[PDB]
Design a protein around this ligand. Structure first.
Ligand SMILES: C[C@H](C(=O)O)c1cccc(C(=O)c2ccccc2)c1
Ligand SMILES: C[C@H](C(=O)O)c1cccc(C(=O)c2ccccc2)c1
Lengths: 389, 387
């Protein structure tokens, strides 16, 4: 019953493992626990500003996935839609394996494959993956200044690493999804996110560029995990040194937009999104997604074998995959406190959130550390679970 | 006793075959030979001198041998993708018995064609997922269509498995004949004439009848029909003349195929069979080197418990080499043979064998489509027993 959340965060700051941390836990749509620890940057020790801004990386994916579900509801496409219907550059895909064998794909990539990371795409930083070296040579993630549409043209020429539908591998497929959304609608994904999600939820600080007053609110990002170079064979030491993002994550590029990363947000903005996922509605009662399609989106859809869900061989114990991210399907296999049906996702800079329908609960932890050797997100979830009976 | 004569005469006396010729050679010279019956039961004309037979799939070892000669001469190789010579065979699809279609994951090669592992089917393959589409396209029925044009129609149809992954007796020897034409810029009938028939003095073998051939052509009997669907049970074995429609013209100067269509004689086919003991003409001219003949005869496709089957009929103890069947287990065989015996047969019940352990060749010529009696194997067994 003590405040384990503050204890976790203060200990991380006091041990020089994270510069600054913010968190909020809501229940029934209202804050029940919240706090902050540390500073905006350790170089000057400026205090965490009001409505501090974070690079949320793959916490972009549940947002872009939710947009796709809205467009499915509105009839733009369906889960079974072949993506080549919208961009013929994804016609005639090939599949490569670890033995240098290449053959034509025997199934078409669908919207559902993109949402479930079963399309056969890879990721630039996937260690040991048969094709990731070719992704890195193409600078798919590193070259943030390249237009989404043009990056997709380069990706489309590369082989998949399995036949669509047959395996699971966490991937660039959410970026493909953002692009296919643009093809299917004739609109830009950032404009669609603004009009259909951010504005109805009053997420005024969320987007692919900083707000006008955003520079002074941007949290510094730390860590040794590097985008420029080969995936490491052992984790870099966990040290608070400012991270060099190269040109991968611009702050003021009006055309920068992605599906798998790239949003800036705030704790308050992301909690508005997370709370919405408990119902599909805005706080006033506008429906962003009907209950039936929200249930379709949250139902466990990819189930895993004995070794479970893994990303670069890191486990997500007891989790299955739904159309928006992870979902807890076996508390008896879980590695940290949770409840059946808890869902959410996380980002490369150690941001983390969850939604727990059994407790009408949402939680989010914001920090900026790339390559963390400490699972701060899960530690904060566990603390909150222990505090909510 | 003359077991060969007893088998043949019994077949004639029981009204099962109209006329039968046979010859067995050892060391290039006849040791057994005979005939029984007539050219046609309607007029009871005797089997003529140098009687002519439609040899159907005994065309395949000849066209396969030609392909081996062209391999030896560097025209192509076993691993050559056929799409290099005819791009209509680029981007093949594969269909299955559950209506699923997907792109082929391997290219069809020359070796696939020679081994019936390319994924092609045959018009009369009962139960085969794609054979209905072959029949709708009249691939075998339409004998007047030029080989090149028939191949264009075939190339648009899906395979029934991915190239290299299974065995199914098929139209692939016709594809091989066509790819030979593409690779050489010559016609397959002209190549066969120059490279095989003329050196072996096979003056009566070809895709059309000789000028004096009409009176020598044996009548063909049987109820197995090319027209309709493959039958669910065999038609009665009765001596009624067969209607070939337009599938097997006698005087079309452009008719040529890889899997069927040759006319030949007993003497001509024995010249070919005897050559396969050495790769040489009787005079000693080399048609195929010993090394490539060995490559062609070595067992290349091995079969599971069900063994080699064509429309579910077994070839017990046989494996497949680049020219046809080859005996690989005498203890599995269903009739007398020796290890390494090889050869093939045709739809009108013609049959031949080469037995290297005995320096022996044999051929039985008759004309019956849809036979319910294995006359070829009965005659091989009789000949083996007379040694
Ligand atoms: C999967 C990972 C995440 O969001 O978890 C992700 C997605 C997209 C981009 C990036 C990066 O920019 C990056 C930065 C430093 C090192 C490696 C990658 C990381
Ligand atoms: C497979 C079979 C054979 O040579 O064994 C074959 C190959 C080619 C053509 C034909 C036919 O014309 C035919 C004639 C009557 C009935 C069915 C097919 C038969």
């Amino acid at each position: 019953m003590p405040d384990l959340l503050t204890n976790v965060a203060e200990n991380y700051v006091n041990q020089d493992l994270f510069a600054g941390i913010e968190w909020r836990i809501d229940q029934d749509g209202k804050p029940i626990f919240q706090g902050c620890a540390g500073v905006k940057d350790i170089e000057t020790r400026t205090f965490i500003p009001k409505n501090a801004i974070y690079r949320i990386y793959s916490m972009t994916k549940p947002i872009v996935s939710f947009l796709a579900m809205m467009l499915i509801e509105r009839g733009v496409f369906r889960l079974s839609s072949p993506i080549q219907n919208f961009d013929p550059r994804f016609k005639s895909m090939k599949v490569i394996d670890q033995h240098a064998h290449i053959e034509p794909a025997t199934a078409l990539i669908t919207i559902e494959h993109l949402l479930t990371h079963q399309a056969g795409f890879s990721y630039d930083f996937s260690l040991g993956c048969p094709i990731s070296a070719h992704y890195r040579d193409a600078q798919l993630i590193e070259d943030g200044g390249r237009d989404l549409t043009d990056m997709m043209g380069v990706l489309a020429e590369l082989p998949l690493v399995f036949h669509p539908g047959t395996q699971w591998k966490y991937s660039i497929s959410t970026d493909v999804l953002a692009h296919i959304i643009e093809c299917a609608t004739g609109e830009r994904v950032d404009d669609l996110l603004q009009r259909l999600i951010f504005d109805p939820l009053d997420m005024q600080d969320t987007g692919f560029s900083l707000p006008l007053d955003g520079a002074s609110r941007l949290m510094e990002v730390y860590g040794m995990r590097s985008l420029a170079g080969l995936p490491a064979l052992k984790p870099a030491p966990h040290v608070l040194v400012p991270a060099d993002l190269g040109s991968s994550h611009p702050t003021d590029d009006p055309d920068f937009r992605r599906g798998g990363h790239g949003l800036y947000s705030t704790l308050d903005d992301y909690m508005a999104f997370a709370n919405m996922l408990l119902s599909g509605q805005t706080p006033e009662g506008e429906t962003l997604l009907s209950p039936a399609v929200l249930k379709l989106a949250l139902a466990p859809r990819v189930h895993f074998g004995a070794r479970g869900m893994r990303i670069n061989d890191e486990p997500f114990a007891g989790y299955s995959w739904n159309l928006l991210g992870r979902v807890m399907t076996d508390v008896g296999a879980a590695a940290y406190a949770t409840h059946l049906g808890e869902f959410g996702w996380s980002g490369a800079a150690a941001t983390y959130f969850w939604v727990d329908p059994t407790k009408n609960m949402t939680g989010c932890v914001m920090t900026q550390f790339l390559g963390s050797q400490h699972p701060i997100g899960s530690d904060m979830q566990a603390a909150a679970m222990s505090m909510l009976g």
